[PDB]
Amino acid sequence: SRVCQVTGKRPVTGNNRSHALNATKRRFLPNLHSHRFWVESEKRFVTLRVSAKGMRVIDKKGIDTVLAELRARGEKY
Amino acid sequence: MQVILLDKVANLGSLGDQVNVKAGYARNFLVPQGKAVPATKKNIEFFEARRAELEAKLAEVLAAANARAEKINALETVTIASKAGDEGKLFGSIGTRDIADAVTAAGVEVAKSEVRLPNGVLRTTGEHEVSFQVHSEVFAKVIVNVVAE
Amino acid sequence: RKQVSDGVAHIHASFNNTIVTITDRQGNALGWATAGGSGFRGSRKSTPFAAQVAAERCADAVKEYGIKNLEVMVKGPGPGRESTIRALNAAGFRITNITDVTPIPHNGCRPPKKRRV
Amino acid sequence: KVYTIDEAARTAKFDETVEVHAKLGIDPRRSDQNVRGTVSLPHGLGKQVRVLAIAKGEKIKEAEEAGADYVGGEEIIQKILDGWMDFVMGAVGSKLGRILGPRGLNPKAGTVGFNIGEIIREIKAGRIEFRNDKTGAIHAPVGKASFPPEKLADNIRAFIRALEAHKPEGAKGTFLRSVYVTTTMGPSVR
Amino acid sequence: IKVRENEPFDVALRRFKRSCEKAGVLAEVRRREFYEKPTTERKRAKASAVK
RNA sequence: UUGAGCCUUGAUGUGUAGGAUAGGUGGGAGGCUUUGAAGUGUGGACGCCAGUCUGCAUGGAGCCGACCUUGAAAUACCACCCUUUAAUGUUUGAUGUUCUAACGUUGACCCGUAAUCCGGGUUGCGGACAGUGUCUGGUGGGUAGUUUGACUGGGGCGGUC
RNA sequence: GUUUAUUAAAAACACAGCACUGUGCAAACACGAAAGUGGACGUAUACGGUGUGACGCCUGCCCGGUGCCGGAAGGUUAAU
Ligand SMILES: [Mg+2]
Ligand SMILES: [Mg+2]
Ligand SMILES: [Mg+2]
Ligand SMILES: [Mg+2]
Ligand SMILES: [Mg+2]
Ligand SMILES: [Mg+2]
Ligand SMILES: [Mg+2]
Ligand SMILES: [Mg+2]
């Protein structure tokens, strides 16, 4: 399902809001994308369905720390 | 990002600078093929320890691979016991492991392949000269005197 | 821009008009002028004169490469066929060789029909 | 430089041939290009004028002493009216217009001094300094400045001539001060 | 067709073109197809060219 | 590389009385050119082929002024430039050129595996495009929610408020 | 041939035939937030949509409006 493995981001519900202020149930979807990440410490490519923000989370924390987290909450990669 | 480099790296890098690169380039190419790394600050000082050490320290140690020759001109004369044929012309002859082994064997300790006797290298008696090598730019002259005993 | 000296004068001489273009040996267009584009329209431009005045116009335009000698290929019937080269000899040009290149079918395409005037 | 390289006037004869041509804005909406009554300039400059004013058969004995040379007459209004190569300047206000002897036919001369008591009273200086520069075609400014007898001493005209910015219109950016002439050209900013 | 005229002269010298092309096969092909009517033409070209 | 800004370097003007193809005002009674010219002779060239400029050159030494006319007088010289055009840049894209490593592969192959899924790997083909997320202009009876007045010798029409 | 099972069987629907138009295949199109699947284990002599309706003899003029197709220099114009 459209869930970022780094951040938990997922679809949210809201309204489109016309000029005349008509609300209509709508969705916001996270900017998802599956990305191969070279894990040096694992001589392997781990590919993650991540949100763009996710990627930035990975760039800052470093993929080892992030995978460390998935491992910590038994999110299987 | 910022990211600090590893190898030389083309139109931007250096060998250990703190450039700034588009993340698309950092992930996907550079860091994976370890040519650079996240400037995680933790790191940028991992590099400050690496800005004092090898450089400031081991180049006044090549100021010792250099001041070995401050003792190349303060003696400036070894003699070789090599005689003379029919007119003061060496009955012997002295090369590099003769001018490095008859250099080492005193207070003048040189590495045997650090003695340039361009050939003369050698074919007569008396005083000669040689080019003594310890550094790439700083060598030093002496005077050699094949003594006919 | 550039220079060439050795060249060719190309003239398209039809009945309604005659168009002149100077080009190097390798037919690569150096300058041009038309009997119609120098004034005269109608019976006006269908004249050996209008052609003469064109050949002229066309020189001051390709002397833009200090041309010196040029072969001369002549195509079509109608006036200014030859009158347009007389203008050229004088204009100030050596004039090597002269060929007629009016194309001739070995009887193929049916030509237009009428002209019940 | 930051101000104006007045020393950027270093083979004619004299270089008072340098000109106050500071820029101004377009006419977007409504805006004009005007010069007041003889723009003086905190600087005498050293100009002995020939000021042609329309005074009377009275002020020929002190209204000729006020930074000038002569003053036209009342007999010489239309009596000196019979030649083209025969015939700043001004006229005294209140109730006096001159288009019956100053309107016909393409010149520029309107400001002098409106006096009904003194021909050159105690304190009235400012006339014999500089001329007038109004709207020409695309803008205004055109005039003259300093000379080859000053350094940044004619830069009293720098903060007192390019400081002559009058209300802009609505869609412009009227600032760009430059001068020079008779040899080359240049300047700085504004 | 071709005149590669050489040195001393200025005149055209191309009387050649009044020996073949131009108004020859050109005035010819320019217009009405013909078909069987040249036969009527050339049938007068011999009645003439007899004398 | 090329469309728009903006900043310097150089262009140029056939209203009428005339020495003659006067752009508007302004400094302005002399600068200039041997820091090697007028004009003959061509070069690139703008174009209403009416004539202008110049890097170059044969060249070899003075032209000018209110001079009287013209609503406005100097190719005497210079400008801040408008008519409109042209040559480096600055940077912005944008259009374009390749690369491969993100990403697509509903080509081929290997293994998990006796598997037309899926995963990993190899290879080829594409490639920073495509595609998707957020934002945004357009279109949108395909769907949806509704509106579509009252008087009235019934109602509607007409008329009226 | 079909059809209003239960007041209409017909001139209505379908039909072979014809035309227009979309579609280069991961087709267009359609059921699906999606994966996936029909189209098709097909590939322009194929597949979809629309209208006309064996066949014979034919199918004239109009592009102003509305719809569509192409076009782009200018004008107008969104987030930014
Ligand atoms: Mg509805
Ligand atoms: Mg409701
Ligand atoms: Mg009612
Ligand atoms: Mg029934
Ligand atoms: Mg029945
Ligand atoms: Mg079909
Ligand atoms: Mg029907
Ligand atoms: Mg029809």
Coordinates of N, CA and C (backbone and C1' of nucleotides) and ligand atoms in Angstrom, one line a residue, chain G residues 5-8, ligand 4:
Chain G
rA5 P -44.1 -8.0 -22.4 O5' -43.6 -9.5 -22.9 C5' -42.5 -10.1 -22.3 C4' -42.8 -11.5 -22.0 C3' -44.0 -11.6 -21.1 O3' -44.7 -12.9 -21.4 C1' -42.2 -12.5 -19.9
rU6 P -46.1 -12.9 -22.2 O5' -47.0 -12.0 -21.3 C5' -48.4 -11.9 -21.5 C4' -49.0 -10.7 -20.8 C3' -48.2 -9.5 -20.9 O3' -49.1 -8.4 -20.7 C1' -48.3 -10.1 -18.6
rU7 P -48.8 -7.0 -21.5 O5' -50.2 -6.7 -22.2 C5' -51.0 -7.7 -22.6 C4' -52.0 -7.2 -23.7 C3' -51.3 -6.5 -24.9 O3' -51.0 -7.4 -25.9 C1' -52.9 -5.0 -23.9
rA8 P -49.6 -7.3 -26.7 O5' -49.5 -5.9 -27.3 C5' -50.4 -5.4 -28.3 C4' -49.7 -4.6 -29.3 C3' -48.5 -5.2 -30.0 O3' -48.8 -6.0 -31.1 C1' -47.9 -3.0 -29.2
Ligands
MG4 MG -46.8 -8.0 -24.4

